[PDB]
């Protein structure tokens, strides 16, 4: 369907507008999940592992690593939030929100 698919037929490719759409959609999805974490009036999410273990959290980094997501953009943003948390300890939810909103306002 493209250059890469002629050499590696089992290749997945998002070009220009499609790639932008993919990335911005994933960013907007993460933002939609994490919008409720922000502030004291936010809501606590419950997260159940594959073993059945329960986590009650409002923390952006915890929620990210515990949500069940397989998106490359989500991976990028999760790593950015993980660095935010490793160096400062706070600012992960706001990090995700500002990333998503920059992407939206640029779209």
């Amino acid at each position: 369907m493209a250059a890469v698919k002629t050499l590696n037929p089992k290749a997945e490719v998002a070009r220009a507008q499609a790639a932008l759409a993919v990335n911005i959609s994933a960013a907007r999805g993460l933002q939609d999940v994490l919008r409720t974490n922000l502030g004291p009036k936010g809501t606590m999410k419950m997260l159940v592992s594959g073993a059945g273990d329960i986590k009650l959290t409002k923390d952006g980094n915890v929620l990210l690593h515990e949500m069940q997501i397989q998106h490359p953009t989500a991976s990028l943003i999760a790593k950015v939030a993980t660095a935010q948390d490793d160096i400062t300890g706070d600012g992960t939810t706001s990090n995700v929100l500002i990333i998503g909103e920059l992407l939206k306002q640029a779209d």
């Binding site: 890469v4 050499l7 590696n8 997945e12 490359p72 991976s75 990028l76």
Partner: protein, 93 residues
């Protein structure tokens, strides 16, 4: 039989045009990553990793191909990167 059952053989102008088209395809993969106004590519490693770059050798190194001409072009990029460390897109183009 004479040669193995799994042994295929192509010959002639078909092979030549096929090799040249494979090379042209490798060049079209990274043609846009050249210059000060190039754009990045987000490649997905088989280890679940991600590689955002506009480096010709990074791109052609994260890709795998089966046509031997495309293999030769990726080896071009590797050679250029090891020798001088730049020009990995100019050489391919």
């Amino acid at each position: 039989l004479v040669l193995s059952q799994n042994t295929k053989r192509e010959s002639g102008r078909k092979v030549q045009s096929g090799n040249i088209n494979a090379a042209k395809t490798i060049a079209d993969i990274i043609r846009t990553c050249l210059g000060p106004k190039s754009m990045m590519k987000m490649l997905l490693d088989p280890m679940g990793g991600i590689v955002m770059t506009n480096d010709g050798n990074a791109i052609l190194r994260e890709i795998q191909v089966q046509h031997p001409a495309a293999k030769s072009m990726i080896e071009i990029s590797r050679t250029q990167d090891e020798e001088v460390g730049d020009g990995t897109t100019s050489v391919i183009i």
